Design a protein around this ligand. Structure first.
Ligand code: HEM
Length: 406
């Protein structure tokens, strides 16, 4: 890899060239690959020369800490590389309190608990339809057959966007989280905003009841939201809607496809599913963004310099043995599932209730109809890493004679 020149103020012993877009031991799994940052030979706060050079807090306590101190760690540049953090202007994430506060309130109206509760029937229906549709096939490509359509259509439904725009939209968000080099972030950004601008003006003239209409005609600071702000808020919703649960579902199903005992457990004790959901969210956490130093600052003995970027992997907190014993083992009965999978501080994920709902429904509905399944033989499952990690393909197979329509 191409390392960037070690800045003068960075100690050589703090260097650890970890590449968040292509971790060295990715073949062992993306979480495993990131967990190497937590080995004994790695300091708690290191500096990677990769992707332009930036710090990485490797421990749950430091990640939580930095996330709570927005005064030193600004959300103004939350992505690595720097070009990505700059071209990034999403709302409410590119804002630090108290500003993001109002915008966070409005985004909550469109994805908050009340919306989720109201959409629960639709969510349940879709899961049941998708699964009953596959149950007899005796096989499927989970990533394209379920993980993608289930959450995305629910989001398209909630946003009032045609399911026909999904391919184009999904490619653009994936470009922002796991860049393939085809275009810069600013370009993926633009392409995404190009799609929204007309829609926003449209729903501004003729407001509807969809999320985009609600956002576009919402109010912030006691006054109306601008088209720009509406667009920046919606760009983020698109990413959360098309590139989060979509990826997380595959990590969990890959796992269940190999854990017959874990499946049996939720089959018999469905009351355990919400706990299983939280534990899988810990073990298969997948997000990693960060902050930018607002000024020179000494953190846990390390001298941080104004302008310095620091990755605070939400993914690492719950994997930290200091936070959970035997962090790599999945135990649905963990007395306390500690994690920051949905973030920490003033930017706690607003779509986590929807995510949990979607996850719990999948677990229940899938295991009901298709209790016994496994990964297709010879299949090699591969992961991908970035601001949000995912799974390349997930071929599953099963005996329809063991399934059952409900
Ligand atoms: C498994 C699913 C998901 C995970 C793991 C996840 C994770 C995250 C994380 C870690 C943050 C904080 C980032 C930071 O502090 O810089 C965040 C913020 C946010 N997420 Fe999610 N998210 C998920 C699903 C969703 C969904 C489905 C939506 C729906 C559009 C969504 C909407 C948001 C919003 C609006 C914010 C901004 C909150 C703020 O800045 O105050 N997320 N998400």
């Amino acid at each position: 890899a191409n390392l960037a020149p070690l800045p003068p103020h960075v100690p050589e012993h703090l260097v650890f060239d970890f590449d968040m877009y292509n971790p060295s031991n990715l073949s062992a799994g993306v979480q495993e690959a990131w967990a190497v940052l937590q080995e004994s030979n790695v300091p708690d706060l290191v500096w990677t020369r990769c992707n332009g050079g930036h710090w990485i807090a490797t421990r749950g306590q430091l990640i939580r800490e930095a996330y709570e101190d927005y005064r030193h760690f600004s959300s103004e540049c939350p992505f690595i590389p720097r070009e990505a953090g700059e071209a990034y202007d999403f709302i409410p994430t590119s804002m630090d309190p108290p500003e993001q506060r109002q915008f966070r309130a409005l985004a909550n109206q469109v994805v908050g608990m009340p919306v989720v509760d109201k959409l629960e029937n639709r969510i349940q229906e879709l899961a049941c339809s998708l699964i009953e549709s596959l149950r007899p096939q005796g096989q499927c490509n989970f990533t394209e057959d379920y993980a993608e359509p289930f959450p995305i259509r629910i989001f398209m439904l909630l946003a009032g966007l045609p399911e026909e725009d999904i391919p184009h939209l999904k490619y653009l968000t994936d470009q922002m989280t796991r860049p393939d080099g085809s275009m810069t972030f600013a370009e993926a950004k633009e392409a995404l905003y190009d799609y929204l601008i007309p829609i926003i003006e449209q729903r501004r003239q003729k407001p509807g009841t969809d999320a985009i209409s609600i956002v576009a005609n919402g109010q912030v600071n006691g006054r109306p939201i601008t088209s720009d702000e509406a667009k920046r808020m919606c760009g983020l919703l698109l990413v959360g809607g098309l590139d989060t649960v979509v990826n997380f579902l595959s990590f969990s199903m890959e796992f269940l496809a190999k854990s017959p005992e874990h499946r049996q457990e939720l089959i018999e004790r469905p009351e355990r599913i919400p706990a299983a959901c939280e534990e899988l969210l810990r073990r298969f956490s997948l997000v990693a963004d960060g902050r930018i130093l607002t000024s020179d600052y000494e953190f846990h003995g390390v001298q941080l310099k104004k302008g310095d970027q620091i990755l605070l992997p939400q993914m690492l907190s719950g994997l930290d043995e200091r936070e959970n014993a035997c962090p790599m083992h999945v135990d649905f009965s963990r007395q306390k599932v500690s994690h920051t999978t949905f973030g920490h501080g003033s930017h706690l994920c607003l779509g986590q209730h929807l995510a949990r709902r979607e996850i719990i429904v999948t677990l229940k509905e899938w295991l009901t109809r298709i209790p016994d399944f496994s990964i297709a033989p010879g299949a090699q499952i591969q992961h991908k890493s970035g601001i949000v990690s995912g799974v390349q393909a997930l071929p599953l197979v099963w005996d329809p004679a063991t399934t059952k329509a409900v």
